[PDB]
Design a binder for this molecule. Structure first.
Ligand SMILES: Nc1ncnc2c1ncn2[C@@H]1O[C@H](COP(=O)(O)OP(=O)(O)NP(=O)(O)O)[C@@H](O)[C@H]1O
Ligand SMILES: NC(=O)c1ccc[n+]([C@@H]2O[C@H](CO)[C@@H](O)[C@H]2O)c1
Ligand SMILES: [Mg+2]
Length: 179
């Protein structure tokens, strides 16, 4: 209400460079906010474990999506007071969350190969840390569950090659946005 806004969704597999891209875009766009799905995970004490003892982090049940939706709604409610306000929402599980389907003005999806994804993942320390065999046992399977949930999407998603440099990825989205 009350002003035009421009909302960008950036999703992709874990470690595809979503957070870096969002931050880089925010540095070079005016009146630009970023909401990161990474901020809305439940604490470890509230995460489930599956039949094989893997913590269930890579599914929407691991996140406080009411709290994230609240932050997104609040951004929208307050946008007119800042004056086109831009919101980038970035996260590994966005395009399977139906309440967001109609909000996007642009949707980007970062893809990288499994080998490169696994490589990057091993360079990270999460809290809690990835348990042994977590990536093949939980992360990649859940990522494939996501991609197939995404088969029902009716809007246009722009697939981006996340093996491009951080600067190429920025530039590619930037060029798209000013068009
Ligand atoms: N375009 C890129 N090329 C090579 N490495 C990158 C690129 N973008 C990010 N990285 C590196 O990949 C790792 C993750 O980047 P980050 O921006 O956190 O990705 P993410 O998708 O937000 N990660 P996550 O939220 O944990 O699933 C870090 O080591 C980054 O320095
Ligand atoms: N941020 C967290 O609470 C947390 C904890 C454990 C694992 N992760 C990983 O973050 C990635 C996307 O942001 C997912 O693949 C999670 O496994 C996050
Ligand atoms: Mg991130």
């Amino acid at each position: 209400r009350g002003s035009k806004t421009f909302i960008i969704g950036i999703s992709g597999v874990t470690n595809s460079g979503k957070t870096t891209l969002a931050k880089n875009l925010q540095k070079h766009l005016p009146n630009c906010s970023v909401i990161s799905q990474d901020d809305f995970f439940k604490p470890e004490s509230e995460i489930e474990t599956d039949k094989n003892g893997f913590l269930q982090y890579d599914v929407l049940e691991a996140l406080n999506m009411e709290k994230m939706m609240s932050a997104i709604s609040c951004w929208m409610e307050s946008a007119r007071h800042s004056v086109i306000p831009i919101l980038i929402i970035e996260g590994f599980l966005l395009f399977n969350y139906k309440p967001l389907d109609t909000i996007w003005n642009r949707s980007y999806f970062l893809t990288i190969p499994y080998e490169e994804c696994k490589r990057r993942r091993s360079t990270r320390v999460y809290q809690p840390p990835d348990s042994p065999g977590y990536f093949d046992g939980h992360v990649w399977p859940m990522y494939l569950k996501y991609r197939q949930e995404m088969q029902d999407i009716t809007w246009e998603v722009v697939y981006l090659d996340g093996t491009k440099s951080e600067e190429d990825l920025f530039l590619q989205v930037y060029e798209d946005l000013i068009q």
